[PDB]
Amino acid sequence: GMALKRIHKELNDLARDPPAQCSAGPVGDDMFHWQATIMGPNDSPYQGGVFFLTIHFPTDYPFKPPKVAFTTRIYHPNINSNGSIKLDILRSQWSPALTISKVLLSICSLLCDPNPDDPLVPEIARIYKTDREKYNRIAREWTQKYAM
């Protein structure tokens, strides 16, 4: 049973090296159910906010990707009303070499750099392409309303 072992080893590695940009841990005693917090990157409309995410590890992890979703609402082109994320490594580009730490780093980078090419919400991607001040302002609004 590689899943439990690797999840424990990953939690140990996160204890030894804490990433300032995010922090995660098992919600209770279900090692296959974690809760993560991603901090808003500086000089970004999400600055100052703290976004919570739920993570479910499959039983044959790391061979299948974890289910990651946003519980805190966020105004982002690639993130849904219910909170799903259009990230390749969670769907098509999953690899057994990826850790939950690398997944949270990829999510932080997607927050820093949204992907307009294939968006989960077309309206926000259009705003980003056309009106960036409106995009930054609406994301600031949403961060003040929900992330705080």
Place this chain on the structure above:
Amino acid sequence: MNRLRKDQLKKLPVHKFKKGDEYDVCAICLDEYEDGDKLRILPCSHAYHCKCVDPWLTKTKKTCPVCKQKVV
């Protein structure tokens, strides 16, 4: 076919691990290689535990877990 068959898997080399070799950690299981482990070697020179990469190479995909390179 995306996956590899077992006869294709057996054509990839298996290296016995000596303490001084070029690999250190199995990118999959994240543990350090121990003296005597069997390692599957890929065409791109990436290596893993047999017990770790063989299930991925056969059950799921035939690409490298690190560099996405197909294994032919």
